[PDB]
Design a protein around this ligand. Sequence first.
Ligand SMILES: [Cl-]
Ligand SMILES: [Cl-]
Lengths: 187, 187
Amino acid sequence: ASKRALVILAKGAEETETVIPVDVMRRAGIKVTVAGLAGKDPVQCSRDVVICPDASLEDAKKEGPYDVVVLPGGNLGAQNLSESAAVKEILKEQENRKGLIAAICAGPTALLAHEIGFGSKVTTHPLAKDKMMNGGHYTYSENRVEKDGLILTSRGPGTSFEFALAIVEALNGKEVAAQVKAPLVLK
Amino acid sequence: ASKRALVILAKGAEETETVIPVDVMRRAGIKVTVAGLAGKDPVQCSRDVVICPDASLEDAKKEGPYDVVVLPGGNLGAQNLSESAAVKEILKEQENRKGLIAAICAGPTALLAHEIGFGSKVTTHPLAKDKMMNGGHYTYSENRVEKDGLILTSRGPGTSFEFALAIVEALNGKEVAAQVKAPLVLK
Ligand SMILES: [Cl-]
Ligand SMILES: [Cl-]
């Protein structure tokens, strides 16, 4: 069966960090659900792009499990993810089932908020390092994409394609990732 | 006054090539209007991301002129742009007023359809070269971003940030482009 991804979309999310992974994962044949944190209605992203989610998170969370849970960044979007009890429950279930969790930019700070994956090596946006490192619960990395077991992190808008291809490689293998990569004209 | 950009969004557009330039241009302080070719309703992009436009093209075209007209790619989106009489009129007006026109991936093939900028050096997605070059009306380039006067072209999803920053440089200068670039964590 095809792999399945849950992308959790909150107000103030970074739209490039949302759309690039959705697009790349769909190119890889992954069944992606863009789930709105607040409900079914369109979401106003950080740079005012408005995205219509496929489902509310309330509905999508009942249709798991997912092979990957993806947390976009954007400072305000990640704060919203960090405050959500529903996100907490989803991430703890994914961690308990030994499923992949992928977060980019400010997104990894929701892992801290929900006490996920402590002891991992992680990266974030440079400006999100201090928040992520509060308490010393992770070891910091400057790699553009970082992966420590089932915790896969990345840094910013400009690492989104690399982040997404790393998700594809983890779920569908290096050959599929390479085939998806070539038509993208990445640098 | 702030510069203004018109981004023309058709069904089947490549969503990364739409969202990345909108985001980057807004980071540069440019007033961006995402205008739906078909009307005011949400647009189903090539990889099924659904974007709510700011306005219909029918309305937005009456609120010009714009400092740049931007044509995303995606094979089917570019075909829709190529078939549109409204797009033809907008591009011919922009060319006549010596305004910037920027197109990415399959997007430049709408320049061919509307007889815009013949004699320019252009790039496209590799798979769109033969369509763009039908008749020999342009000279082809493999540069990731190409600019010949007021015709600015680029190649694919993975050149979208570079394309957008080239628009910013053309409108707001190299220093603003460099300042916008740094937080993106580009490679
Ligand atoms: Cl942000
Ligand atoms: Cl396409």
